[PDB]
């Protein structure tokens, strides 16, 4: 078979990390696809509901309150060794034992019996994970405190879905694991291809994995590379890549203008949002602490800064119809849990913003054009990120809108922030105190609960709010009462309304994705529910 050439659009170097628990970014998660997507276990239907037949099956027992995972008999690592029950449990240790440096702790994992006490070092094992046919068998039982309504769906976050190669990694010290060749350039994997070579920061050469249990691929090889935003269209014009994933909305018209490509589409499981920095993360106690001293402590300020943006004007000018101003944090793909009732910051309202600030005592100084409260000037730092050729223009455009409401906003270090640096800034405890506003974007988990973005114990709560109303909202969505979908829908609506009113974050955009595919390629798809794409693609 053929030799496929794929890229992911990224202005930052690739961060190869083959262990899901230690990898935070969508870029490498996507590039890992041919190798098993960081060793994902379960197949799903097009509604993300688990089905039988993947690398493993999962069975829920709601009476016992357990999940039982059965790995295929012939599931192997790419060195021919068996994938075992212990490999599945070891994924949990990579997140829960703090020595590995994971940023993926969350209150969802507290619902596994014994896992909280393992995470704090009070227990030396995870009591709720046991092995009915031993560590070297194929079966794992996970004991919960309670079932959660999302457990039928991949991405639920209450039980994990990947394996880690424990026998391969057991003599690498936890503190060294993320930077070891064994999780970066020289991993074991379980997918239809294995990474024969990895060039740090740049590329992966994939060849078939002869130990794969499933459909054997048609292709001889796949190369997967990063390509910059400024070089992407020319790469398609010159046929440098057969497929490019992750392309920005601003290039969509150029891409449709090209001869020799089919352009695929999907509803993006995505949200972008503006964050306010309101606290710090306490690593010892695994808790967000909302104690930062800032004008952003004033609810009226948070709301005003949201109302002053012109997100619809930006989307109309630049996005080629692919971005839609978001009304809430729950995107359209989760159609059962959205409501046209919910009003957010999708319409600019400069008059309301100015009124809110006047009402809150932030009085305009007519000499300077900026507002003040008891001598404090309303000045903030905006950690805007590098993007496409329009990113500087768009960030300055928001600064200009904020000046209209008497808020002085300046870029972090007078420039846009590189992506890998920004991720370090956001995740490294205890968090930084030198930014006020930033923009985040998420390739969301395929189940709509946002515990793993905002729960009190999660470092992924980048602005470090900790609010009883929000915490009760998040818990209500996943409660036993939410096993009635009527109740869960109302809980989702309340959460969306409460997040918009508290305005600790402001929803920005929903999106459609697109991927150009050279006409020589057959079998590529963006359809959800396609489980064997990498084995089906050919030239």
């Amino acid at each position: 078979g053929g030799n496929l050439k794929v890229a992911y659009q990224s202005d930052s170097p690739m961060k190869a990390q083959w262990l899901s628990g230690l990898s935070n970014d969508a870029t490498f998660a996507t590039m890992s696809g041919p190798g098993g997507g960081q060793d994902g276990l379960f197949f799903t239907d097009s509604g993300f509901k688990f089905i039988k037949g993947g690398a493993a099956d999962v069975a829920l027992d709601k009476e016992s309150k357990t999940a039982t995972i059965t790995l295929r008999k012939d599931l192997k690592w790419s060195d021919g060794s068996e994938v075992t029950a212990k490999d599945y449990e070891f994924t949990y240790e990579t997140i829960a034992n703090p020595a590995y440096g994971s940023d993926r702790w969350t209150d969802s994992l507290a619902n596994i019996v014994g896992l909280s006490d393992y995470h704090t070092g009070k227990a030396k094992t995870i009591s709720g994970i046991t092995f009915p046919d031993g560590e070297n068998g194929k079966v794992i039982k996970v004991q919960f405190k309670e079932m959660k309504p999302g457990m039928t769906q991949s991405g639920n976050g209450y039980f994990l879905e990947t394996v880690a190669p424990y026998q391969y990694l057991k003599d690498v010290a936890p503190k060294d694991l993320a930077s070891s060749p064994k999780t970066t350039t020289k991993p074991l994997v379980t997918g239809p291809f294995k990474p024969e070579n990895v060039v740090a920061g740049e590329s992966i050469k994939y060849v078939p994995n002869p130990y794969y249990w499933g459909e054997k691929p048609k292709l001889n090889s796949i190369t997967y590379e990063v390509v910059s935003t400024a070089k992407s269209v020319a790469a398609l014009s010159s046929s440098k890549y057969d497929i490019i994933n992750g392309m920005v909305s601003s290039q969509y018209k150029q891409v449709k203008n090209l001869k020799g490509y089919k352009v695929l589409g999907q509803q993006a499981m995505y949200i972008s949002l503006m964050y306010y920095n309101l606290g710090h993360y306490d690593a010892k106690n695994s808790i967000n602490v909302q104690d930062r001293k800032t004008p952003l402590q004033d609810q009226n300020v948070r709301q005003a800064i949201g109302y002053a943006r012109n997100v619809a004007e930006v989307d109309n000018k630049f996005s080629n119809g692919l971005s839609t101003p978001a009304n809430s944090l729950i995107p359209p793909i989760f159609k059962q849990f959205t409501s046209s009732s919910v009003k957010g910051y999708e319409k600019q309202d400069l008059d309301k913003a100015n009124k809110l600030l006047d009402e809150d005592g932030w009085k305009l100084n007519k000499s300077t054009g900026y507002r003040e409260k008891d001598g404090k000037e309303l000045s903030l730092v905006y950690a805007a990120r590098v993007g496409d050729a329009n990113a500087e223009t768009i960030a300055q455009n928001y600064i200009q809108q904020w000046k209209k409401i008497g808020v002085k906003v300046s870029l972090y270090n007078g420039k846009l922030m590189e992506f890998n640096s920004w991720v370090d800034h956001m995740t490294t405890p205890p968090g930084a105190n030198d930014w006020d506003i930033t923009d985040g974007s998420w390739s969301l988990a395929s189940e709509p609960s946002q515990q793993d973005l905002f729960s009190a114990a999660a470092p992924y709560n980048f602005g470090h709010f900790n609010d009883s109303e929000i915490t009760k909202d998040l818990n209500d969505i996943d409660s036993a009462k939410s096993e009635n979908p009527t109740y869960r829908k109302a809980a989702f609506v309340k959460y969306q309304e409460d997040m918009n009113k508290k305005a600790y974050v402001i929803p920005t955009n929903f999106m459609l994705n697109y991927t150009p595919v050279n006409k020589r390629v057959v079998g590529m798809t963006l359809d959800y529910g396609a489980m064997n794409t990498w084995s089906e693609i050919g030239v």
Binding site: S10, D11, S12, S20, S23, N24, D25, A26, T27, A29, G40, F48, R104, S154, G155, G157, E161, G246, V248, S249, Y270, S272, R385, G387, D388, F419, V423, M426, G440, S441, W442, S443, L444, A445, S446, E447, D452, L453, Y460
Partner: peptide, 8 residues
């Protein structure tokens, strides 16, 4: 399936 930080 998990939440991942996107560059755009």
């Amino acid at each position: 399936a998990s939440n991942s930080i996107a560059s755009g």
